[PDB]
Design a protein around this ligand. Structure first.
Ligand SMILES: [Cl-]
Lengths: 221, 225, 228, 228
């Protein structure tokens, strides 16, 4: 209950996720456990998908590295046990999306973080609000964090920043943590997995264009 | 109480402006009252400068045609009243800023307007544009930056404030058409005079007329930490 | 395109509300229709219960001057159809709650309205109750988790100040809107939203924060103060 | 080379235009005594705002000082075996300048515990009370024609943050009871304190907790009525 077991709850949550329609093998389950306990590699692969990079290698703390290439046709390609493994770009983005929904860190309010400038839809941002719901008909997504630029705060001249788990690169100042915060983390994480909510960073191609029309349709009068 | 006469206050305000240290000829003032009562030309030359357009021409309702050419040397070329006048781009942008500070409209709260999608980063923001309801007015930038102001603070119609949509900083040069005018009574008229009375007494301009020297200075002001 | 007759849906919606433990006679229906078609009396009745007043009558040229008086015990007393009817305080609070959910008005974003300064606090400094001009920046705000029985009708700023961020916002309910002054933008989308929004509150059996019972009002204070 | 509030305090009083008080040394040493003791500077504020009879600052022999107050608006104290009586409005502006010099500046994200019994007697009004509050915005100018007043802090309820259902609360330093958490503090945050304190004292501003009764009713009518 209080102790979090993201490893044991990972395989069942992946199967309970309704949008999952790809092959789920033991290696697929093992790949999420490796990337789950190492978000620095999980976020580096998201940049491979979001920024359409050519490849990305994750060097361990020892020195050995693991290569993950991206095909220009829209597909993630790598080799497990020295054997080729294919992953569609729309299916692999959902894979790393559920990992962040399970192995993602819930930072408290007031946590001063440093967003990755390369993933800012193209310095220091304090987290003022977390896990805000999206609009109706888009309950499958959520804004992980959101806040103002530190230390200016709620000055309307400074526009707010929508921060996902993939945008946070470095944590500078941790927020307040106590028994209420841990209770707030538990009751908020369960709803993020119960309603099958993904981060807005893992928005698919069709959901991106459809959400733009949702904004323009009322004014399309 | 006091009826606002932008044509009467324009000559004294333009001369009392501290940053104004350039030509204040009679034709210059005659051009300000011409662009003030004709907002379609005040915003058109603004698009000529900001969007780096080649030229721009405007005809009045009676046929008064004036052509504004933008030289590659950064000079505003135009011929007005049988006389050709050159205007440095870093100085002509300040000239049209005082015009908007005197002749600019002051829409009430809740005014659903349409924005000029051409000026405001089109693909960053789809063809007709989503409507913006002016929910705020006259917003200061920061300390040591009181020389510029945010004209309007807008939410996206009809989603509102509670909706998790990024807000929009709107300016008079940015507002294209007015789709729905807000409530305007005696409290609103005195609020217009209170806001405009402070924007001209403190010698403030809009962020649309922010010089590139000050635009980068405002970026490093918040990047210093 | 489908028009809305709140009188037709009124009795079956009263059956949809499960918390009903009071006697729902036909006189209860006609009284709600009387309070529904005439929101001028429905709101004054709410002030009789919330502010613990002596009485309140709705003088009308049609002669339907129904006087509503409540005792110290919280017993709403009136006479309808030439017959004396007695109601309780907490039961009459939930009675007008369904009326407001069925006969409630939906104003678009940017609708500048007037508010009643009497319900809020002791505004004797004003001594008028040219006051409380508030523009509606948001509508139908869900209250909170485990509190879906109630909801915030409107969320807006003080007019003509706007989102000044130096004056705190106002959570406006339909029982607080004093008088409508300006109307927002209305198109096919707005009327489409009005048609689907008023049916969702009746679907989820939601009330307004004005009808917040003390037990649930304290329960909301525990959620804001006591951890979990 | 750091802040010397004890040294600047007598210079600020000379600079302060609103001061209509005697420039005696007893007032100087008493303000410095209250400046280095927040429990005493904030305790007498509860004696005046909540309109209490007496209040004693129990401490060492001599350090212990009692503050009595009658109903006709007169404060009473004795400092160094010397009895001095201040008027209620004369003693409010006195502690207001002390909180402007010896006031504490907290960084962003500082979760503070508030004095709830003093909160109820404030601008609660429609906003309600709304325990733990995080400081999101600091030093907000009150308004025009009220520039001499400032809002020390304002934020949301912890750990909810900016939520549409969560009403924001404006927090003065006199309202801060206990400090639970602390925000990030680099050298820019220290520079911000030099920028903020160099502005509040130069513009001669006071916290909204020190709003005089003449300006309290005047600010309320400005929001409600088109009086100006
Ligand atoms: Cl408050």
């Amino acid at each position: 209950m209080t102790e979090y077991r993201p490893v044991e709850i990972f395989p069942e949550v992946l199967s309970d996720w309704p949008t999952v329609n790809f092959a789920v093998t033991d290696d697929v389950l093992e790949l999420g456990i490796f990337l789950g306990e190492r978000p620095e590699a999980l976020k580096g692969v998201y940049k491979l998908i979001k920024l359409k990079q050519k490849n990305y290698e994750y060097q361990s703390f020892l020195g050995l590295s693991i290569l993950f290439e991206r095909s220009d046709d829209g597909q993630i390609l790598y080799t497990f046990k020295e054997k080729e493994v294919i992953w569609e770009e729309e299916e692999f983005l959902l894979f790393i999306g559920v990992i962040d929904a399970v192995f993602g860190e819930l930072y408290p309010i007031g946590t001063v973080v440093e967003l990755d400038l390369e993933l800012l839809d193209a310095a220091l941002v304090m987290l003022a609000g977390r896990r805000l719901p999206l609009a109706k008909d888009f309950e499958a997504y959520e804004i992980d964090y959101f806040g103002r630029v530190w230390p200016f705060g709620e000055v309307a001249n400074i526009p707010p920043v929508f921060v996902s788990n993939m945008l946070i690169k470095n944590v500078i100042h941790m927020g307040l943590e106590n028994e209420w915060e841990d209770q707030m983390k538990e009751v908020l994480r369960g709803s993020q997995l119960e309603l099958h909510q993904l981060s807005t960073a893992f928005m698919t191609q069709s959901d991106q264009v459809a959400y733009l029309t949702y904004l323009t349709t009322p004014s399309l009068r």
